[PDB]
Amino acid sequence: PNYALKFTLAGHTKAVSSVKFSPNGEWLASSSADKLIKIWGAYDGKFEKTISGHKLGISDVAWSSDSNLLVSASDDKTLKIWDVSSGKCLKTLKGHSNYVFCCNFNPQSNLIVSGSFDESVRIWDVKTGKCLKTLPAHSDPVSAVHFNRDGSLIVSSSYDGLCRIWDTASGQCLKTPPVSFVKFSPNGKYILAATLDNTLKLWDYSKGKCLKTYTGHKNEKYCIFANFSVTGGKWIVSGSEDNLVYIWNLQTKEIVQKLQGHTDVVISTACHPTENIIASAALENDKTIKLWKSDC
Numbered sequence: 693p694n695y696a697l698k699f700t701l702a703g704h705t706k707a708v709s710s711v712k713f714s715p716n717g718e719w720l721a722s723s724s725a726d727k728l729i730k731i732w733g734a735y736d737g738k739f740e741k742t743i744s745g746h747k748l749g750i751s752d753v754a755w756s757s758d759s760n761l762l763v764s765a766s767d768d769k770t771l772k773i774w775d776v777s778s779g780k781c782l783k784t785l786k787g788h789s790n791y792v793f794c795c796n797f798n799p800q801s802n803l804i805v806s807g808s809f810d811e812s813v814r815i816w817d818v819k820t821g822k823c824l825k826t827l828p829a830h831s832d833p834v835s836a837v838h839f840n841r842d843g844s845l846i847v848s849s850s851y852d853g854l855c856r857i858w859d860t861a862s863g864q865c866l867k868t869p870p871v872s873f874v875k876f877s878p879n880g881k882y883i884l885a886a887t888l889d890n891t892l893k894l895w896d897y898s899k900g901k902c903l904k905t906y907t908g909h910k911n912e913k914y915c916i917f918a919n920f921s922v923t924g925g926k927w928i929v930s931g932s933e934d935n936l937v938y939i940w941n942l943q944t945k946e947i948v949q950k951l952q953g954h955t956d957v958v959i960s961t962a963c964h965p966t967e968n969i970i971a972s973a974a975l976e977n978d979k980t981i982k983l984w985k986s987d988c
């Protein structure tokens with residue numbers, strides 16, 4: 693690939709914590725320690741709106757499948773569901789007893805999953821805003837939560853060193869160095885897992901075996917989002933503590949590009965759902981989001 697900087701998105705006044713493309717490809721949402729959500733054009737980075745209401749900083753945000761709703765996870769111990777068009781907070785999800793770190797809708801988008809410093813994973817009904825289940829998932833803060841492609845499975849990770857797979861319907865555990873990030877692959881068959889020893893691993897979840905290992909980046913301190921890029925060449929994409937975006941060939945594990953431009957830890961990356969476009973965001977020395985485009 694030949695990802696090249698096209699736009700730099702400024703506006704947040706503290707570290708940016710997460711960026712996510714809307715499933716319809718129109719928008720990029722960002723969250724920040726500055727308690728704000730910002731929406732930007734996905735293709736030209738054009739600032740669209742600020743969404744406000746959380747009383748403390750935000751760690752994560754995620755889109756509904758129809759791109760109409762956002763959910764945000766905050767240090768104020770709540771999640772908020774937002775109508776993106778109006779910017780209004782529709783529901784406040786109350787129940788966690790510590791910071792909410794990570795969140796995601798299921799594909800049907802009737803449910804939200806959340807992970808917290810209170811070591812629990814919670815499952816929420818989008819329409820009532822009520823907590824359906826509280827999973828005693830981990831013995832340390834939960835670093836990632838993600839649904840598989842039909843919402844039947846939740847994968848979670850934690851600084852307790854574990855990755856667990858949960859049955860959404862029953863909340864019961866199906867299968868079991870800090871694990872700083874996990875997420876299901878685009879075909880459902882794999883889980884990509886980060887550990888705080890500068891290592892990413894591709895796991896066959898059905899077989900329970902590590903298939904590929906990716907190294908070269910720096911990751912000993914922060915939970916950093918990683919991604920599958922599927923619109924062109926099949927890559928793994930991750931931020932890094934040396935301020936670079938790393939892009940590996942999924943099959944060969946070779947680094948194929950390093951994106952230079954940020955001036956702090958690249959805490960979050962995201963891949964556009966249909967075009968060869970990457971968003972990246974960095975910590976407090978930088979506070980900008982960068983949009984990179986590749987011809988392949």
Ligand SMILES: CCn1cc(-c2cc(Cn3ccnc3C)cc3c2CCc2c-3nnn2Cc2ccc(F)c(C)c2)c(C(F)(F)F)n1
Nearest residue numbers: 707708709725749750751752767793833851914915916917
């Ligand atoms: C509330 C405002 N806010 C949150 C963050 C933030 C964002 C992300 C990116 N992220 C978010 C969700 N999923 C991912 C990959 C990661 C971190 C942080 C700040 C805290 C943190 C992060 N990684 N490690 N720690 C210390 C730590 C120690 C023990 C633990 F068990 C755990 C779990 C963490 C930020 C900032 F962007 F500034 F970092 N601001």
